[PDB]
Structure formats: C-alpha cells, structure tokens
Amino acid sequence: NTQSAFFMPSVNLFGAGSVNEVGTRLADLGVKKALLVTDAGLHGLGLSEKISSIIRAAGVEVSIFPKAEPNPTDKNVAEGLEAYNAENCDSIVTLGGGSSHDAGKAIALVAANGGKIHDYEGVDVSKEPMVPLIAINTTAGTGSELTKFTIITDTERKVKMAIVDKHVTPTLSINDPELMVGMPPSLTAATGLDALTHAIEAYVSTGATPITDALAIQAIKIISKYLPRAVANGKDIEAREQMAFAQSLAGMAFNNAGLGYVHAIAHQLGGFYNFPHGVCNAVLLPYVCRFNLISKVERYAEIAAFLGENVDGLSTYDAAEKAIKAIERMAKDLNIPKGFKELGAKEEDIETLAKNAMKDACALTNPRKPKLEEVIQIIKNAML
Amino acid sequence: NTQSAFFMPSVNLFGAGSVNEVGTRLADLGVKKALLVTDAGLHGLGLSEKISSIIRAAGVEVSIFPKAEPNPTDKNVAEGLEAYNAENCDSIVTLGGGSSHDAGKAIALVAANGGKIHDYEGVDVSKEPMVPLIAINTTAGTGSELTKFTIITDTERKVKMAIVDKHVTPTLSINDPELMVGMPPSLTAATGLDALTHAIEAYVSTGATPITDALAIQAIKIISKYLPRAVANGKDIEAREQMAFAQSLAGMAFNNAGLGYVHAIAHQLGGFYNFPHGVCNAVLLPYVCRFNLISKVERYAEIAAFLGENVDGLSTYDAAEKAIKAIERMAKDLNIPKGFKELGAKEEDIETLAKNAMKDACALTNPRKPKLEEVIQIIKNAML
Amino acid sequence: NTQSAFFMPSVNLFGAGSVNEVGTRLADLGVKKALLVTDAGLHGLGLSEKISSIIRAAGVEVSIFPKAEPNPTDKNVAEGLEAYNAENCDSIVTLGGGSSHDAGKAIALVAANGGKIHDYEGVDVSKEPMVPLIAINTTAGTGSELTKFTIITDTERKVKMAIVDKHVTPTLSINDPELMVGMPPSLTAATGLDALTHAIEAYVSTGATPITDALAIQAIKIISKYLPRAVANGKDIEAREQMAFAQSLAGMAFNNAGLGYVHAIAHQLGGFYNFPHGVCNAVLLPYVCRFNLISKVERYAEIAAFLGENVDGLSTYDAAEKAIKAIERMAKDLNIPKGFKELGAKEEDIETLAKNAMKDACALTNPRKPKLEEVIQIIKNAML
Amino acid sequence: NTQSAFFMPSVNLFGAGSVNEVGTRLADLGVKKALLVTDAGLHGLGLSEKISSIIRAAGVEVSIFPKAEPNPTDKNVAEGLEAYNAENCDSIVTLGGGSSHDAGKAIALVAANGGKIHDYEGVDVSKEPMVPLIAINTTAGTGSELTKFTIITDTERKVKMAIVDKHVTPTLSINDPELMVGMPPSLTAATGLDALTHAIEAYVSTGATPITDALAIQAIKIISKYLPRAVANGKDIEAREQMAFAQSLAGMAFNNAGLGYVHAIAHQLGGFYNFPHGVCNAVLLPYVCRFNLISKVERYAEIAAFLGENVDGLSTYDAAEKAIKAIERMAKDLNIPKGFKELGAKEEDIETLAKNAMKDACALTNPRKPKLEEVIQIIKNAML
Ligand SMILES: [Mn+2]
C-alpha cells in the first residue's frame, strides 16, 4: 500500500521567551509533580532552577534529575525511573539537548509500561502512551522535542539502540532560542550538522512524502545560510533563531520520513566510543551520500542547489557531486575532524560496527540497499 | 515578541485505505459513542454507512447526523448539539468536506464549553478543549481536519463567523484519497482553489514563519501542477493523491500563519448569498493580491515562479504581476465565474459586507492594512 | 491495474518493392484462395489486377471485390462476405487505404464469427480470430494494416462505428511506398494529418505507455518534417518513404495507447456528411487539443518542441499554446477548411453529433473527461 | 534494395500480474502438454511451481525441465529435446532469462525441423516454424521473448552461435515486473547493461530504420534514468517496471536493426570463459564505440544527449566523446570490471577470439567494417 502518517506534538511553542510558559502549560495538563530531566552541565549553570522556579510559581512541584549523560544509557533510565517513583512524580519535563529528551521519554515510557528500556527497541513495540512530558529544547539539532524516537545506549553490546514508537511523542514542545545562546562553537556545529544530516537523509529516504519534502528543503536552505553564522558568533540572535527553526523543520521531516545509513553507522560509532553524535554524522555524511548517489541522483542535484551551488549547464551527475563537495567544505569550515582514526576509533571493530549498522532501524529507509561489504567500505572510508 | 506556535493533531493518517483505521483509533481514545457528522449527499452515497460499519466493528456506537449543510449554520450546530446530547455521544467523527468538519468542531466546542457557537467568534475565546474528534476529509481543499478554525454562519447578521480557537484542533485526522475520487469537477476546482488561496494568503501573511513558508511553497507548486489534472479527470489517481497532500500542506500553513482579506471578504459574500466558499475565494484572489502587492512584492514574485511562470529579466514588480495573471488564468481554465454580479450579488450590500469584513479575524494578518473605502473598492471590482 | 499489452501483426514488410512478396507469403500460410478487397479508384487504375498477378504467380487464386468506398459502409461488408463465401475463399487480401483495410477486416471477422458487422461495435466483442488476412497499404494514413481497429459506417444511424477488437489484427502487413506515389496532394494531406492526429492523441491518451510514447514522438517529428514535402511534390520519394514509416509508427502507437475526442467527433461528422476522415481530424484537432490542455500541458509543450517550435524561456503553458499554433499553421498550409459549415454541415445536428460522439470507444482514452455541453461547444467552435 | 521488415510476437503482455494469464493463453492455442523450460535457480526458489500451477489450473499439462544453463549449450538443447519427446509435450513455456528463452526456442525449433542446433547458425536457416511458445521474462535485458534470435553455445568450437531465423519469434510474450524483484544487484546491472548495449548497437547499426531508432532512443533514455535505481534497490517497483519497458524497447530495436561488434566479440568471450553476457558487453562497449566513432559520430553525439550529458557549445566529435565517457561512468557505478584479464582471459586466445568474432552474424551490421588486426587491438585494449 501507499499509506503514510505524520506525527508531532499537538502544541509547539517557538521564539524568544517561550520557556516562561512551561509551568502554566504543565498546570493545564492537570499534573502535580514533574521530574526535571537534564544533564549535569545545564544543572551546573542554574538553568535547572530557573525552569524549576517557573514551574513552582504555577503550583506544580519539581524534582530535579540532572543525571542524563551525552549518549544517555539504560542505567541512566533505570536510575531516573527509580527517582521518578521514589519522589512520587506524575509528569516529566526534559530540559536540554537530545540526551535529556531521550532519557525523559524512556523514563516516561517505562514508567507507564513497566518493562526495561531494551524490550521496546524497534518500531511501535510498546502498548501504552507515556506519562505527560513537556520537552524544552536548548540545542540546534536532534528535534527530539518533536519525535517518536528515543536513542538509548545499550551498555553491554555498546550499541545506541533506536526505539521508534508513536507513544514517545512529547505532549508539548518548547523551542526557546534564548536558551541556545550558550552553546559553544563546537556544540553549535555538531548539533547543526546533525540537523543537516536529518534533513538530507529525510530528503533521500524511501519514506519521504511531499510534506516531509517541504520541511527538509526549507531546513537545508536555512542551515546552509545560518549555521556557519551561528558557529562564528553564538551571540548572533538571528542565526540562533533561524537554526532553531531549521532544527524543528529537520526533526519534523526525519521523524516522518525515516533516516538512512549515516545515522545507522553513527549510532554504532557513538555506542562504541561515546563520540558526539553530530560529529559522527558530519564525518559520515559525504561517504554515505556518495554511496547513495546512484539511487537518488536527481535529489542530490536538488540538494546542491539548496546548498547554494551553481548547477547551471551541468548534468544531474555533476550537480549531484557538487552537493557532496559543498557538504565537505561546510564540515571543514566548521572545524569538523577529518576522520575517525584520529578520534580514537579502532580497526578491529570495523566489521562489528558494520554488522550492527545493518540492524539499526534507520537503515530500513536508506535509498541504496548495501551488502555487508559495502557498509565495511563506508566505515573504512571514514577512517582516513 | 517574536514568539510563535505550531498547532496540529498529534496523529494524521494519509494514503489509500486510511479510513480503515478510524474504528480502532476511536477505541484507543476510550470513547464509547460518536456522533458521525456528515452532509446529505455523502450520506446518500452510503459513505456514512461504510464508516459506521468500521466504527461499530471496533465496539464503538455510532449515531449519524447527516445534516451539515454547505456553509454550516448556527442552526445546524444547535440541532447537532441536541442530537449529540439526546444520544449521549461522548465523541464526534466528521466525514466530508470543510462544512462537516466545522459543524462537528462547533458541536464539540459548544458541548464542552456551554453557551452557543456565537459566543466564541474571535481568537482563543473558549475555556475548555472540545470533545474528542476524529476528522475524515473527503475534499481536496479546506484543511479543516487539521486546523483550529471553524467557520459557522450567523443567520441573522448574514455573516460567516470565523472561530479561531486552539481548542477545536481535531484529536486525529484521516486523509483518504480514495474517498475523494468521487468529487465532481466543479467541487474539485472550488476546493482546490480554496487550498491555493490558503497557501497564498499564508505565504503573504504577517504571521508567516519559516515552517509555514516551507509548507505553503510546496502546496503552491503541487496545486500548480495537479489541480487542472484533477479537474479534467477525477479518476486520475496520481492527481488526487497530490491534491490531498497539497490541501494538507496549505492547511498546515494557514492554520499557523493566518489568512487575509480574501477570506475576510469571502466569509461575508458567503454569509449574504450562500455562494460556494472556494468560488468566492477564486473570484476575490486576484483583486486582493493586487491590493497587497506593494506590501509583499518579493513574495508575490516568488509565487509567480511557484506557479510555473518565467520571470527571467523582469523586475520584481513585473514578476508579481505575472503571478496575478497566472492566478487569473487558472481561475478561467477551471470555469470560475467572471464576477459576483452574475451570481446574485447586490451593490446595496457592499458597504455592509465591507464593514463586516473588517471584523473578521482573517483580516488581522493581511499584509496591507486597508481603510473602509479600500475594502469597498475591492468588493466593487469583484462585482464585475 | 498496472497491466498493458502491445498488439501488432507478427510480420510487417517495408520498403520499395515489398509488395512483390504477397504471393509467396500467402503460400507459406498454406492458404489457397483469397478475396482481394479494394476500392473503385485503384481498380479502375489497374492496381488490383497487377497485385492479383503477383498473387497468382505463386499458386494462390484471387477473386477481386473492388467496391469499398471512402468511409466504408455496412453494405460494403454485406456484399463482401457474399462474395467471400460464393467464391470459396480461405483468405483475404486488402489493397488500398483505410477503407480497404477496414472493409477486409470486417468481412474477415464476420466470416469467422457470423453476426452482422454492427454486432461487434465496441471493444473486444468477438470470440473467434478472423480469417487469414494480408493488408497492403497505399495511403500514408490510418495504420490499419497493423491495428486492431475497423471503422465501418452505419448507414442507418449515420454513424462511423468503431470496432476495436484484438481478433482483427491482420496476419501480415505490407508498406510499399511505391504504391503511394500516385496519391494526389489532397489525399496525401488528409491521410498525413490523420496520422498526425493518431500520433498526438496517442501521446496524450490515458493509456499511453513508454512504448507507445516512443513510437508517437517519432511519428510527430517525421510528419512535421516530411508531410509538407509530400504534399508539395508527390514524386519526392524520400518524403513518401518517411511518410510511410511515420504512418506505421503512429498506427502502432494509437493501436496500443488509444485515441481521443478528435476521432470521437470526426467519426460523427464523417458518418453524417461523408467528409474525408483526415479533413475532419485536421479541422477538429486544434479545438480538442485546447480543450485537453489543462490535462496534459506538459505533453503538449513537448509536442510543440517535436513540431519544430522554439519554446525557450517559456512557461509550460505558453509552450503548449505554441503547439496548438503550429498545428493550426500546418493545417492552413495544407489547405484544410477552417471549419465545417462551408462544407455542408448544419447547426441543427450538432447536438446529435455530440451525443453520438460520447458513445465512440475513442472517447474513453481522452485525457479530459467532458460533459455534453463541452462536446457541443467543441463542435460549435469547429463549425466556423 | 531498400527493403526492411519488423518482427515481433503478435501479443505481448506487460505489467504486474501478467503472468496470471499464462494458463488462459495456453488454452487459447489449443496445446495439450507444455514443457516448462527454466534454470536450477528459479526451480529451487519455487517459481517454476507457481507458474506450472497457473497453467495446470487451466487444463494444460506441464513437465518442468529446469536444466537450462547460463549460456545455454547444445548439450542442454539435446537433453531438452530428450525430455520434450520422452514426455510427448506439444508446447513450450520458457520462464526466466535469455538462457531459458534461447534453450526453449532451440528445443522447439529442432523439435520442428529435426536437425541439430549447430546447423541453424546463421541467418534464416530453418524450413519450418517451431512449436507453440509463450515466453515469461524475469530478467531486464535479453529481450528474447520478442526476438528471432536464439544464442546457443557450441561446446567444441567454444563459440556462442547466433541463430537469427524468422521461425523463432515466440507466439506470445509475458513481461511481469513482479517476477524481476528478486534479481540480485549484480544480475540487475549485467542484464540492464546488456539491454543498453542492444539499444546503442541498434541505434548505430547499418540496419536501423526510423522505427528501431524510435524504440532505441526511448530505451537509452529510460535505462539512463532507471538502471542505477534498480541496481541500488531491487525492491523499487517503479525502477523495475521502467527497466522492463526499456529491455523490451531494446529487444524490439536490435531484433529488427541488428547489433554489432560488441556482441560479436562478447559471444566469443562468453563461449571461451563462461563470463556473464552483460558483463562482457559492459566491458567492451566503450572500446567498440570509440572504434565506431568515425562512422556514426552524429548518432554518438545524440546518444550523449540521451544519457543526460550536456553537449552545449561542443563539436559533434566532443559530444560523441562525452557519450563514451558517460557509458564508462555508468559501468563504473554498477561495479563492472574495467578489463578482462582480471576475470581470467588469456592472450593466446585473443587471436582465436578475434577470428571467431569476424564470423558471428551480429558483425554484419556494425557501422565500421574492420580488419582482423583492428579486432585484435579491441580485445587487447579490453584487458588493463
Ligand atoms: Mn541525529
């Protein structure tokens, strides 16, 4: 069949100052105590309490759980659900980047489902919707405040599992760019390139629809113009607002179109070496795009135009290639590592990495279907 | 502030066969009796009964209210509220075009807030969200299955009131293009041109965002290619699916960006003479675009490109004029009336219509802020 | 259904002198006596006997039936079968233009199925293949030596009936350009413009496939270059051979894609007034193309390029309009009447003409689905 | 003489599900027992049994001969005749690729003339038509379901003989794209490049006609767009259906125009080393095309445009070179070896290969007539 679906929270707030409403919104849902899931860094800056004050000034109680780690783990979820039950909480508020969002979603799902986080790895394997959750986003990538995806790291196999379930769509989302001014340049670049990867993989995905196409095209155009600006000056409010829009666009697109082998392989490099997710995506993107080129050459030529390249007088092929080179130039200008060999990756794991990549759910929508040998080749290419 | 928000149902189903999920979805909400709101035509074709079977086969009871009329009225809403209450319905399922969705939305709102429908004319006037509602769309225009708009006619003032309230966002939406194959050509043309008006007014609205821009641009390009094909052959399945996507994209765009003076004046022409909504929009669109040109000339030039026009070597002003000419050519090719006078309009009402048009909420987002005399002149030009 | 089928005689002979094989090929079929179906003009010019000689010099007997009339009638078929069964024939050889092919196909079908020619009006009505038949073509039009169409006129209804049956695809086809050198200019023009109508209607038909498209594009390009040369000088052997190829390409294309409302209306103007089939097609072609424009604007723009027009810097719409202008110009240069009233048509019959046109099988594949009102408007536009 | 001919089965089915008709069609011919000729791979996967079931469910008997080998051999044909007679079969159904079609055609031809397969090598060597045959195609290249070619391998001379005889045109053809989804990527690439070789060699062949040109041009354009898509994802239904159309187009074209020295040399390399047919064609095509440039430079420039290359501002010569470069890049993107020595070819054979190649029937229509030495240089260049 030709059936498809579009998922997103019913209410999504944007713009400078939107965070000052989390508490009132939390009160309208009729919940009483929220577990504030954040990371140690944002808690170690006072943002946790700024938000907690906003919620308490509306009559809702807060218990701060600042233990979500970059690449959140199953242990983070177990500790967070134990805190959730020990503190008699009925809601969850996530504050931070994708790690906080995914930790809160996992806690919220298991808190309504019982089980363990690992049992719901795959697509729509869970049975109940999660507890009320409001997601407040402070990074310009991921889009997890809008998605039905939670990426939990399995510590025994060292694999960043993709739990794709409609029951983890947040109740309400908040995208306040004033909370993103503090992202240091490396973080700005990595999150922005994770959003660009989302838009590109959604555009070439086999589950793409005219709606997701609209959103992904706009995301590529905005990132192409504003991401380098946000890396060059993080106090540039226009660039921050445009990247907040681009991040939400890319999230809406990939959430409903699917991803591809960039994320399938990046999840394995991040589960093995705890590298930053966006850095992994930025290193892999050119190689997977070249691998996919013959399957979606017309769409890569369109991406070349979306990224500002002049494609006048060129075959679809020469334009498709200009797209990969513009992506490489951007990664180089945002001071992205040239390879995984320098970052700490080991040749002995390549084969394992590739096999786990062919089991990731993100691989199902890649436009080109490889054999194990070709995944090994992509991973080998990202080593230099 | 620079704050904005994006509203939408959390789950939106697309594709051939989507209606086959309605019953299960109703059961997931935990509802027990739904009032199925439709019109006399679709009930006479048996669609009401086909959907009723799907709903009852999942353990939910159905009572059919097939009395929503083109341009639903406050009396339709009162009768619907009585049927809803006499039969103890706790949910609503709308089946049809914009008239059925709005009748159901109005019934659900009044059933959850009290009073009468007239009490909520304006913006965010209600206090409680509306009863559970699933919207099944069968026309390729309006978008109402996704919006927070319900247009109900006040019969005494002869005014189609626009209730723009966050509390009438449907719970779930279903867009089955197989239910749209049966639209006769004039309805296909009128609904399609209403969707085109939605995308254009959203693109030039003062409340536009990068997100709404993405959606409206895609909608214009798709309508430009496929609406004439669906009008020429209603069994062109590709054109029908593309039109379903375009109508949803335009709905998403205008729901969150706003409309303009095309809709503000059309609501009055429809409240006075009961003309079909899309025909009023098609007649008025070139005149309001011309009136608005000086405020958004760059975006009208972009619309000219989206509509297939060649704008090489032209000033932005000349390209915006090519956009108006292409809109007029589409209206002529889809057998849209030349003016309003042949349909029954009376010059002795222009002033009343104009005064009411300045009270519509859609006028609040029009890019050019007019004076009574200018609204009058617009209606007068749309007379011949 | 994404299913389609391509039908054609298994052996098709081309080139100067190919007719000199008719006898031998008939002997390979193991046939013994054949009815030579032709028209009065070629029989009075002596071609019937010449061809009969080649047939007899190979051991097959021949009895000539030379009374098929331009716009063949049911009476022609009656007499034909009469002769076929009186003269004890086991095969049929058609010699001439579309009238001889259609007469022979009808006779061969009734000789194997037994009814009345009227009984098989429509699509695939018969149950038995027709008697062995070799078609020798002498006009650069129709294509019937390879098609499954036979158009016989119903003298009573005054309707050119369309019998579309897979069982009348001829056994063997012969395209000898040496027999067409004698076509006077008006016949050359009318048959060539009937071939152009075949190619255009095949290219825009709803039953087009990549194969029929391939054939139709070539037919348009060759007709565009060589038909005016063949009308200007019937002894231009190059033009005659290229026109023979183009007529066969267009026949293969329309045989397997379908025709449209040009033919649906032309069959009615021809059954009422005995006008030349190709002249009717040439008068009607621009009006039906304009009516169809909104359904196939992209393909009409391509036709404009195939007809030699420059479409650089034009919208698809303007390029399609240039295609219609090029068609009008060619018809004007080949001295085609601008309209029908000057030829003897009467306004009082349009309505009848329109109703009968909507019953022709050629109307089923027209890209735009019309209403009676619109068919009347087309015929009225084609009267002046 | 300027004479030519077009040959093809009278009925050719396309589209998903066409195979469900085979049984009905077998009954219409009046056949009692059919030999199902296939290979061990298709028999071991169970497809043979599906088709045998459709045929027997229509009252025709089936005996499966699953012993046709890639590069069918005279021993397979002799054994197939042994099975055919030792089971009193009166018809043949071929299911699979070119090897199955050619094996079945050869068995049926020897079954009707009594000779041996080696005796009919050449052009139009047989005296009787072959037994009734329906060809079910599962590969996207050969075209044998429509051709009068059977390529059977002579185990002693180590040469693939080409039997081009009017009597092996199948009775009916079925091209079901659903049966091609299982083609692995390398097989998809090799068969598709054999179809491309057919179309190119037909376009530049000395036996080209305007009809073969039309078909070949369309085939090249479709292959250029869809072959890399079918190789990148065999489950892409659109790509598979377009490739089925392109393979049929290329078969129709080469069947009636001729091939050239690509096939002449590849037949010898496949008879000597059991290489895949399509890989030999893909490796040799650029070298024979360069050799041919001076004879058909205008048609190679046109092929450059058909393959998507931009030729603006170039001499005809540079455009023809862009065509050779485009063929090489396509072969590289589909992982085609650049040379033959890494596959096992030996130099002491070059001369024998060349000698045998000037002896193949496909060499008569090549546009440039070479000398032994030039063929030797072609094979030597195809080694690196
Ligand atoms: Mn990501």
Ligand SMILES: [Mn+2]
């Ligand atoms: Mn509207």
Ligand SMILES: [Mn+2]
């Ligand atoms: Mn005709």
Ligand SMILES: [Mn+2]
């Ligand atoms: Mn071949």
